[PDB]
Amino acid sequence: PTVSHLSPVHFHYRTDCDSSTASLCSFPVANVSLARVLMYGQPYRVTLELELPESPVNQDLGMFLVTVSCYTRGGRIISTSSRSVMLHYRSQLLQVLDTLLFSSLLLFGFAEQKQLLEVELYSDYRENSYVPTTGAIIEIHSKRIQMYGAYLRIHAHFTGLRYLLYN
Amino acid sequence: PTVSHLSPVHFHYRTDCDSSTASLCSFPVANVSLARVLMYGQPYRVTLELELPESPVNQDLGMFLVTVSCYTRGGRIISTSSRSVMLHYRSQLLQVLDTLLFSSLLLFGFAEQKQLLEVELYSDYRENSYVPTTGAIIEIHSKRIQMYGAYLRIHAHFTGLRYLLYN
Amino acid sequence: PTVSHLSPVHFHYRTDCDSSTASLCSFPVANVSLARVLMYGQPYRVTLELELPESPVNQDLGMFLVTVSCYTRGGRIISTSSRSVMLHYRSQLLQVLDTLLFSSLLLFGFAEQKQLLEVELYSDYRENSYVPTTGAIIEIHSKRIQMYGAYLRIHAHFTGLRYLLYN
Amino acid sequence: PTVSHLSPVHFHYRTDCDSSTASLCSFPVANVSLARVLMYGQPYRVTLELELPESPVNQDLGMFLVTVSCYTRGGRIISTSSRSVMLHYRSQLLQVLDTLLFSSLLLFGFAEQKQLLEVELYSDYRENSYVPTTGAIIEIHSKRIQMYGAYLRIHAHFTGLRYLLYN
Amino acid sequence: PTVSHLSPVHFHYRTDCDSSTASLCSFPVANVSLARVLMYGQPYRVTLELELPESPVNQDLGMFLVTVSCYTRGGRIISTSSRSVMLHYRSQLLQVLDTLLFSSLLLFGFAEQKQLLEVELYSDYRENSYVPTTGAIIEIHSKRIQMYGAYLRIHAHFTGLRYLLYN
Amino acid sequence: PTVSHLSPVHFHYRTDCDSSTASLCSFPVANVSLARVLMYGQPYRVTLELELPESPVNQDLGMFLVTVSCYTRGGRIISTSSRSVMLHYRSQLLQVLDTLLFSSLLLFGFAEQKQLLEVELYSDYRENSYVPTTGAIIEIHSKRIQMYGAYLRIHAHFTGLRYLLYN
Amino acid sequence: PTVSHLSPVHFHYRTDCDSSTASLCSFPVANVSLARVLMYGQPYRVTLELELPESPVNQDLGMFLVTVSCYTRGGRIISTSSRSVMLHYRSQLLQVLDTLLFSSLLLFGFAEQKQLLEVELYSDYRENSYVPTTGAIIEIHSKRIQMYGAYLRIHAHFTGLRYLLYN
Amino acid sequence: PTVSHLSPVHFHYRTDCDSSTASLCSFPVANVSLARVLMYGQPYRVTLELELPESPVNQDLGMFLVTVSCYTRGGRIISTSSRSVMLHYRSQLLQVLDTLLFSSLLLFGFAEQKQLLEVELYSDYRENSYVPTTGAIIEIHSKRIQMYGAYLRIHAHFTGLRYLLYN
Amino acid sequence: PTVSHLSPVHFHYRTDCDSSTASLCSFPVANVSLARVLMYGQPYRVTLELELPESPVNQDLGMFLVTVSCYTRGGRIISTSSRSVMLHYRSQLLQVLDTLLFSSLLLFGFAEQKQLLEVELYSDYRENSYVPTTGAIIEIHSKRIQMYGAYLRIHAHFTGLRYLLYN
Amino acid sequence: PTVSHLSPVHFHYRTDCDSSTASLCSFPVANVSLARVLMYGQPYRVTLELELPESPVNQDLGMFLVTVSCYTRGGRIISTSSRSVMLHYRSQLLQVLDTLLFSSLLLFGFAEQKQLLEVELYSDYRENSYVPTTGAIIEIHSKRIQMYGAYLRIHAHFTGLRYLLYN
Amino acid sequence: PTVSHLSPVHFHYRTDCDSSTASLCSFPVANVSLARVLMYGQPYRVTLELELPESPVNQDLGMFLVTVSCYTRGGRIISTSSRSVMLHYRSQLLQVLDTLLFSSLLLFGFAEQKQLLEVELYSDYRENSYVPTTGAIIEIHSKRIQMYGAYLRIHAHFTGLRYLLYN
């Protein structure tokens, strides 16, 4: 075991526009409930492992800002952060080679044509005694992103040489 | 056996517009009657397994919101939930490979070019003594979705070692 | 033998508009006379097996609503029902494989490129002592549905072990 | 021999319009003289076997309505009927396969690329003592149909096991 | 020999229009002089064998009406008749196969790419004592019908067993 | 020798328009001097053998009317006649097969890609004692015909079985 | 030797327009000096052998009129004549075969892709005692005729057995 | 180890425009905090290693300007610099060869289709006694630069024989 | 040697227009100084050998008039002449065969894709005692010609059988 | 060692236009500090070796003027110069052959698809005792040039036979 | 050695306009200093060897004018000349063959795809005692000429047998 918890992010968005294309109405957003893993003074790592398929719409998407806004039990925004993430580029021939050689896994469902993007919104987050962390608002500032789901993973920074096992 | 009840969902919608395109008129909606499997205190898992073909119109559909609205015998809404689901991406070469190597099943009807999307609208649902669950309203906020049918599956969350049989 | 009667449906529709396209003029509707297979209390299964060719126009058709309206000898409407049906998708590579390997049946007329859609408008139908069933109106809310014919098949729900004869 | 009479239908139509395309000016119609094969009480089968070539124009035609209107010696219309008919769909690969294998008949004139469509406008037509059947008006509500000719075939419904000989 | 006379039809038409296209200016028409083969009481078969090349312009022509108008020495119209005739369809692969296999005849002029259409305007024609048949007006209601020539062939209806000589 | 004379026709036409395309100003026409081959009472055959290349412009030409107008020494018109003619259709594959197998003649000039059309404007032309035949006016009612030349040929109709030698 | 003289024709034309196209400005024309070969009473043959390339511009040219206008030393026009000539049609496959097989002459300059068109303006020309022939005006009524040069050729009509030297 | 510190840059930008294109709303900008490695007198090399994928959007980008703006703890700007950088060009054939031969690394994630651009904004930087370096603002003056991340790498200019460890 | 002199022509022309295409401002012209080859009474041959490349712009050029205007030392124009010249046509297949088989000369510069056009402006030019020939003005009436240079080659006409040596 | 110094040029330019294409706001420019290599009286060679990739945008660039402006310590301009330079042309086949036969160097980074253009702005530059050279301004008058960097290289002109070592 | 001097030409031109195309802004010009090689009375050959790449833009350039304007020490213009020059045409097949066979030199830089054009502005130039030659102005009247450089070359016309050293 390890000192960590996963809070999957359930993005929702508005749907009242024309919607005559593959473009959503409003920017995806979400609340998350963090209600210990956090301890006073200790820095913690907060990331949003985000699951993007390699569908053609996503390749043409380009960069898009991602922001996280932590807050307290009373809703007060403790801190704000932002990072830019982009689906990694792979050439069309490379994709075909990847699809071919990994056919034995993709066909049986052991592998899938998706990318996990590790947007590290915090390399060192520390608990405040007078201001407790209770939940997070997470956003993906783009109306054309296609995604399956996202996890807000927290873990104590102290890992040592054992970090190599996560490769 | 399993302590569960499958309430198949029959989506209906309006049809009075011009309708000169594959796009429909109004947002698909449904009303399902849940009338025990539910018991007080016990958490329950509510999911809508959605049967989408891999037709080209669906691959270009993009993300689309799905919402479930539970309510009582008197119509009062107990709780409201929403999730976003999308048909999984598969490259054209992969599809040609899937269509070929699984031809022996598709041709004889043992397999079909369709995806079951497990929209989990409630990972832990529990019954209220003063507010009984009687029915649900289920929506798919898109005028371009093509679907065959949907089951609202409720199952007691206790799995334990029994997962080996459900895998 | 089986306790059933087949009431083939003969759709008719208006023809006075411009009609300069494969799209018809008005919504296909039909009337069918049910004049006993029905008995008080016993549940009955009412379905409309719909014969759709796999012609290209039908594959781009998309979903379309099919509604049934039962009524009495006096014309009073007993109940109203609706189910959405869609022609099953088959990739272009799959169709060519079907056309090829099943050529020996397609050419000699033993097989044809058509689909039967089992639109089950009623899984539990029962006769009412004060309201006798006499006939039904059946509709297919689409101006582009190419079809050959349809049967409204009623059958006693008691199957039990007898399903093996139907399998 | 059989108790039947064939009354070939000679469709004629107006031609004063622009006629700048392959679309006729007015709806095909016809009069036919049925002047016994009909006898009182017995129901009879009336069909219009319609000879449509498989030319590309006809495949894109889509559905079209065919109506038969019987009438007496005095011109009074006895009954009106309508059945929708469509040319059966065959894929381009299948047609090429049919053309290749059946070349030995198509080239020498023993076979032709045409479909006989059996519009059964009456499965049970009964003669009336006070109203004799004299003639019929037959229509094909489409300006884009291409056809060679049509027979209105009548025959006593009493066939029994002998019907298999018509296969 | 046989009791018959062939009166070749010389279709002529006006030409003072714009004529900037393959379409003619006015409807083809013709007079033909029949002045015996016709005798009182005996039925006669009157047909117009029409020589249409299988050119692309003719295949896209579609159906076209053909009318015949008999008349007396004084010009009085005896009877009027009309039929619809269409060039028989043949697929491009079939046409190529015919051109290839029957090349030996086409190249040396023994065969030609033309269809004889037997527009049978009268299956039973008889002479009237007080009204003699003198000549006929014939028409082809189309501005796009490419043709080489036409024979109006009359013949005694009595064939009987003699059809074997014509088979 | 034979009782015949040839009067080659020299068509001339106006040239004052824009002429920005392959379309001539006015309908080709001509005068021909017929001044014996003609004898009183005897009917004679008059034809115009017309030399048309198989150039693409001519294949798209379609039907065109050709008229002949005989006249006397004083210019008085004796008779008028008209026959429709059209270059015979030959498929592209047939032409390629012709160009190939007959290359040995076309290349060395012994054969040419031209068609002779025998417009038999008169199957029986009779000389009149009171009206002598002196000259002919000939026409081809089309502004798009491409032609090399034309012979007007007259010959006594008395041929008998010797006609086969002209094959 | 032969009783003949060649008077090469040198066409000239105007050049004042925009000339933004391969089409020329004005109709080609030319004078020629015939100043004996001509003798009184004797018929003579006057022809213009016209050297046209087989360039694409010429094949789309179509027919074009050619006229010759003889005149006297005083300029008085003795006689007027006109003929219509056209470059002979050769298919694209034939031209390629001509280019290939006759390469050995075309490449070394012994052959060239050109046609000599023998526009015979006079089959029988005779000299008049009171009116001497001095020169001729020659025209080619087209603005799109690409040509290298032209000879006007005269020769005594008497050929007889001497044609063997010209065949 | 070496006398150096890395200060990764986290660019953020506005997201309120239409954003219906791969172009971003505003110029990428960033703020980086440097709070020693810097010492008085000693020259230092400040560079921004920038991680650009080889995606087609970036190849068409063309030259873009990158600027750095150092400043103190109080915000006072110490020095301003600017260098223009561009992604290196590689032909489509070269890219395919790179993708092919280096497939064994790209597929397993050991290699990726990205370029590190060493924008050396300062070859000789030295600390000021009265003005301390605290942080730097960095920019990329282009709305279309797709990038993963960047490091502001500082290192003592003293290399000498130690370059062998960096080669 | 021979009694001749070559007076190379240097064409110069205006250049002040927009010149946004491959078309020149004004008609090429030039003066040439002829200052004995000429002798009184004797007719002489004057030609302009014109060096046109076979570039596509020249093949589509079509005909173009070329004129020479001789004049005296006083500028007085002695005589005026004109001829029409055109680059000889060579099919694309012929050019490819030429470029191939003559590659050994083209590559080494011994042969070049150019045509010398011998525009013979005077087959017999006679010197006048009272009017001496001094210089010439030579023109090429086209704004789209591409040329390298030109020689005005004069030579005594008396050649006899020796003319064959010039081949 | 050699009597020379290299002063790399760092072009900077404005960036506040629309910038919707691969074009820049203003002409590239730069200052450079030349602060001995220069000596009085001796003329010196000054050049700008310019590193241009062979990317397609640069090939379509065409010529572009380059200017150098020397100046003194006080900023006074000593001399001005300009030379036009252009990236060398290499055919598509040649580039592919180079990309292929030199793959072993391009892939490993030993070679790159770039061209060094040696714009020699001064073959003899002499130092003035009363006017010292201190710095230079260098420009590239094009908004579409793509370049990596430029060196302004100075070297004493006294080379002799040793110049061959620079090959 | 030889009595000659090469005065390389450095073309400069304006750059103020939009310049959004490969076409330059103003006519290329130059000024060259000629400051013995020239001696009184002796003829001299003055030429401009112009280095043009075979780039596609230059092939479509077409003919253009080049002029040289000599002048004295005081600027007085001594003589003006103009010769029209054009890049030599080479078919695409010839270029491909040239690129292939001469690849070994092009790849190593021993050969280049460029043409040296010798514009012989003067074949006989002589010095005037009262008017000395000091410099020249050279122009290339085209805004689309892509060029590398140009030498103005003078040489004593006396070659005689010495041409063998230059062949």
How many H helices and E strands in chain E? 4, 8
Question: Minimal Cα–Cα distance from C90 to chain B, Å?
Answer: 7
d(CA G43, CA A36): 127
d(CA E68, CA A149): 77
J76 touches chain H (CB under 8 A): no
Q: Do G10 and I91 touch (CB under 8 A)?
A: no
d(CA F103, CA G145): 28
d(CA K125, CA K78): 11
**Residue matched to tokens 């993708």:** H99
Q: Do J22 and H61 touch (CB under 8 A)?
A: yes
**Residue J134 is encoded by which pair of tokens?**
């201190």
Fold entry, domain H4-13+23-157:
Jelly Rolls (2.60.120)
Q: Which residues contact D65 (CB under 8 A, 6 or more apart)?
A: C12, C13, C15, D82, D83, D84, D139, D140, D141, D142
Q: Do I89 and G113 touch (CB under 8 A)?
A: yes
d(CA A130, CA A150): 30
Q: How was this structure determined?
A: cryo-EM
**Residue matched to tokens 């061959």:** J164
The sheet that has B44-53: what strands, in order across it?
B4-9, B149-156, B44-53, B114-125
| Nearest residue to H90 (alpha-carbon basis) of J21, J22, J95 | J95
The sheet that has K149-156: what strands, in order across it?
K4-9, K149-156, K44-53, K114-125
J17 touches chain H (CB under 8 A): no
CB atoms closer than 10 angstroms to residue B74: 8
**Residue A98 is encoded by which pair of tokens?**
């990847």
Q: Which residues contact C157 (CB under 8 A, 6 or more apart)?
A: C42, C43, C44, C45, C123, C124
Q: Are F43 and F125 in contact (CB under 8 A)?
A: yes
Beta bridge partners of J53: J114
Q: How far is CA F79 from CA E68, F75, F134, G81, in A?
A: 27, 12, 12, 28
The helix-helix angle for C92-101 and D92-101 (nearest 10°) equals 20
CB nearest to F89's CB, from E19, E55, E107: E55
How many H helices and E strands in chain D? 3, 8
Tell me which amino acid residue K158 is: F
Chain H residue with Cα closest to A57: H22
How many CA atoms are closer than 13 Å to the CA of E20, on its beta-carbon side? 3
Question: With respect to CATH, is domain I23-157 assigned 1.10.20?
Answer: no
Output DSSP code: residue K40. B
CB atoms closer than 10 angstroms to residue E81: 17
CB atoms closer than 10 angstroms to residue G35: 9
In three-state secondary structure terms, D40 is strand
How many CA atoms are closer than 13 Å to the CA of B119, on its beta-carbon side? 26
**Residue matched to tokens 């009456």:** D122
Rounded to a whole number, what is the largest CA-CA distance in chain J?
56
Concatenating the DSSP letter of every residue in F44-73 gives EEEEEEEEEE--HHHHTT--EEEEEEEE-T
The bridge status of strand C29-33 relative to strand J64-71 is unpaired
Rounded to a whole number, what is the largest CA-CA distance in chain I?
56
d(CA I78, CA I131): 7
Q: Are E95 and E54 in contact (CB under 8 A)?
A: yes
d(CA C161, CA G111): 92
Q: Are E71 and E79 in contact (CB under 8 A)?
A: no
**Residue J69 is encoded by which pair of tokens?**
């402006």
I98 touches chain G (CB under 8 A): yes
Q: Do B89 and A147 touch (CB under 8 A)?
A: no
| Chain G residues whose beta carbon lies within 8 Å of the beta carbon of residue F110 | none
Tell me which amino acid residue F118 is: E
The bridge status of strand F149-156 relative to strand F4-9 is antiparallel
Tell me which amino acid residue E144 is: R
Q: Which residues contact I1 (CB under 8 A, 6 or more apart)?
A: none
Tell me which amino acid residue H135 is: G
Q: Name the strand (E) or helix (H) holding A79.
A: strand A79-85
CA dihedral (E141, E144, E147, E152) in degrees, to 10, reads 0
Chain E residue with Cα closest to D9: E83
Q: How far is CA B136 from CA A13, B7, B47, B147, in A?
A: 21, 10, 12, 19
d(CA H42, CA H38): 8
Beta strand segments in C19-158, E: 29-33, 44-53, 64-71, 77-85, 114-125, 135-140, 149-156
E112 touches chain F (CB under 8 A): yes
**Residue matched to tokens 């279709």:** E11
Q: Mutate which of E27, E84, E102, E141 to disrupt the D interface (most D C-beta within 10 Å)?
A: E84
**Residue G37 is encoded by which pair of tokens?**
């070969």
Q: How many CB pairs under 8 A join J and K?
A: 60
Beta bridge partners of J11: none
d(CA D63, CA C11): 11
- Specify the length of chain K in residues: 167
d(CA F61, CA B157): 81
Q: How far is CA A125 from CA A37, A40, H150, I39, in A?
A: 12, 10, 22, 111
**Sign of the four-CA dihedral E66, E71, E75, E76:** negative
F31 touches chain G (CB under 8 A): no
| Nearest residue to H58 (alpha-carbon basis) of H134, H155, H146, H154 | H146
Domain boundaries F23-158, corresponding CATH code: 2.60.120
**Residue A70 is encoded by which pair of tokens?**
């932590």
Q: How many CB pairs under 8 A join E and F?
A: 60
Q: Are F83 and F48 in contact (CB under 8 A)?
A: no
In three-state secondary structure terms, H164 is helix
**Residue D121 is encoded by which pair of tokens?**
């406008």
d(CA A105, CA A109): 6
| Nearest residue to K101 (alpha-carbon basis) of A157, F52, B11, J94 | J94
Q: Burial code of D88-103, b = ≥16 C-beta within 10 A, e = fewer? A: bbbbeebbebbbeebb
Task: Supply φ then ψ for residue E101, to 5 degrees.
Answer: -65, -40
Residue A95 Ramachandran class (φ > 0 left, ψ -120 to 50 alpha, else beta) = alpha
**Residue G158 is encoded by which pair of tokens?**
């008497």
d(CA I158, CA E44): 89
Tell me which amino acid residue C138 is: I
| Chain C residues whose beta carbon lies within 8 Å of the beta carbon of residue D64 | 15
Fold entry, domain B4-12+23-158:
Jelly Rolls (2.60.120)
Beta bridge partners of F143: none
The bridge status of strand F43-53 relative to strand D4-9 is unpaired
The bridge status of strand I43-53 relative to strand H114-125 is unpaired
Question: Minimal Cα–Cα distance from A157 to chain B, Å?
Answer: 30
d(CA D121, CA D44): 11
Beta bridge partners of C127: C40
**Residue D100 is encoded by which pair of tokens?**
């290749």
| Nearest residue to H26 (alpha-carbon basis) of E161, E74, E148, J19 | J19
d(CA A88, CA A61): 11
**Residue matched to tokens 């009877």:** E79
Helical H segments across chain C, by residue range: 56-59, 92-101, 103-106, 163-166
| Chain H residues whose beta carbon lies within 8 Å of the beta carbon of residue J114 | 89
Output DSSP code: residue J87. P
Q: How far is CA G146 from CA G15, G28, G59, G143, I64, in A?
A: 15, 11, 10, 9, 10
Beta bridge partners of D9: D150
Residue G52 Ramachandran class (φ > 0 left, ψ -120 to 50 alpha, else beta) = beta
Task: Supply φ then ψ for residue E63, to 5 degrees.
Answer: -65, 150
CB nearest to E65's CB, from D13, D96, D99: D13
d(CA F68, CA F86): 16
d(CA B33, CA B44): 17
Q: Name the strand (E) or helix (H) holding H96.
A: helix H92-101
Domain boundaries E4-166, corresponding CATH code: 2.60.120
The sheet that has K135-141: what strands, in order across it?
K29-33, K135-141, K64-71, K77-85
Domain boundaries K7-13+23-165, corresponding CATH code: 2.60.120
d(CA C55, CA C110): 18
CB atoms closer than 10 angstroms to residue G62: 20
**Which residue numbers in chain I precede an interruption (C–N > 2.5 Å)?**
35
d(CA G97, CA I94): 11
d(CA C44, CA C121): 11
3-state secondary structure string, chain G? CCCEEEEEECCECCCCCCCCCCCCCCCCEEEEECCCCCCECCEEEEEEEEEEECCHHHHCCCCEEEEEEEECCCCCEEEEEEEEECCCCCCHHHHHHHHHHCHHHHCCCCCCCEEEEEEEEEEEEEEECCECCCEEEEEECCCCCCCCEEEEEEEECCCHHHHHHCC
d(CA E86, CA E142): 11
Class of domain J4-13+24-158: mainly beta
d(CA B56, CA I112): 57
Fold entry, domain A24-158:
Jelly Rolls (2.60.120)
d(CA B42, CA A112): 35
Chains contacting D (3+ CB pairs below 8 angstroms): C, E
Question: How far, rounded to the nearest angstrom, does the alpha carbon of residue K100 sit from its chain's CA centroid?
Answer: 28
Chain D residue with Cα closest to C30: D83
In three-state secondary structure terms, C60 is coil
Tell me which amino acid residue E147 is: M
Q: Name the strand (E) or helix (H) holding I98.
A: helix I92-101
d(CA I11, CA I95): 29
Q: Are A19 and B143 in contact (CB under 8 A)?
A: yes
Q: Do D113 and E97 touch (CB under 8 A)?
A: no
**Residue B47 is encoded by which pair of tokens?**
């999911």
Tell me which amino acid residue J49 is: E
Q: Are H82 and H108 in contact (CB under 8 A)?
A: no
Question: Minimal Cα–Cα distance from E15 to chain F, Å?
Answer: 7
Q: Name the strand (E) or helix (H) holding I105.
A: helix I103-107
Task: Supply φ then ψ for residue G102, to 5 degrees.
Answer: -95, 25
Q: Do J10 and H83 touch (CB under 8 A)?
A: yes
d(CA G71, CA G137): 8
Resolution in A: 3.2
The bridge status of strand G64-71 relative to strand G77-85 is antiparallel
Q: Do C147 and D90 touch (CB under 8 A)?
A: no
Q: How far is CA H45 from CA E109, H4, H48, in A?
A: 92, 10, 10
Measured at the CA of C105, the angle between CA C101 and CA C111, to 5 degrees, comes to 110
**Segments making up each domain of chain I, as ranges:** 23-157
Q: Are E125 and E4 in contact (CB under 8 A)?
A: no
- Specify the length of chain G in residues: 167
**Residue H120 is encoded by which pair of tokens?**
């050396």
Question: Minimal Cα–Cα distance from K36 to chain I, Å?
Answer: 30
Class of domain C4-11+23-159: mainly beta
| Nearest residue to G23 (alpha-carbon basis) of G164, G112, G123, G142 | G142
Q: How far is CA F60 from CA E52, F19, F93, G93, in A?
A: 15, 19, 17, 20
Output DSSP code: residue B87. P
Q: Are B58 and B115 in contact (CB under 8 A)?
A: no
D98 touches chain C (CB under 8 A): yes
D5 touches chain C (CB under 8 A): no
Q: Are A50 and A116 in contact (CB under 8 A)?
A: yes
d(CA I16, CA I18): 7
d(CA K102, CA K86): 24
Chain D residue with Cα closest to E85: D148
**Residue matched to tokens 């990764």:** H8
Q: Which residues contact B44 (CB under 8 A, 6 or more apart)?
A: B37, B38, B122, B124, B125, B126, B127, B154, B155, B156, B157
Measured at the CA of C85, the angle between CA C84 and CA C90, to 5 degrees, comes to 145
- If 0-12 CB within 10 Å is exposed, 13-18 middle and 19+ buried, where does residue E147 land? buried
CA dihedral (C45, C51, C52, C54) in degrees, to 10, reads 110
Q: Do C12 and D82 touch (CB under 8 A)?
A: yes
In three-state secondary structure terms, F15 is coil
Question: How far, rounded to the nearest angstrom, does the alpha carbon of residue G33 sit from its chain's CA centroid?
Answer: 15
Q: Are K70 and K134 in contact (CB under 8 A)?
A: no
Fold entry, domain D4-14+22-157:
Jelly Rolls (2.60.120)
The helix-helix angle for J92-101 and H92-101 (nearest 10°) equals 20
Q: Are K4 and K153 in contact (CB under 8 A)?
A: yes
| Nearest residue to E60 (alpha-carbon basis) of D56, I91, I43, I62 | D56
Chains contacting H (3+ CB pairs below 8 angstroms): A, J
Question: Minimal Cα–Cα distance from H73 to chain J, Å?
Answer: 28
I18 touches chain G (CB under 8 A): no
Q: Are D106 and D113 in contact (CB under 8 A)?
A: yes
Q: How many CB pairs under 8 A join B and C?
A: 61
d(CA I93, CA G97): 10
Q: Are A32 and A66 in contact (CB under 8 A)?
A: no
CA dihedral (H36, H37, H42, H46) in degrees, to 10, reads -140
CB atoms closer than 10 angstroms to residue E76: 10
In three-state secondary structure terms, E156 is strand
E63 touches chain D (CB under 8 A): yes
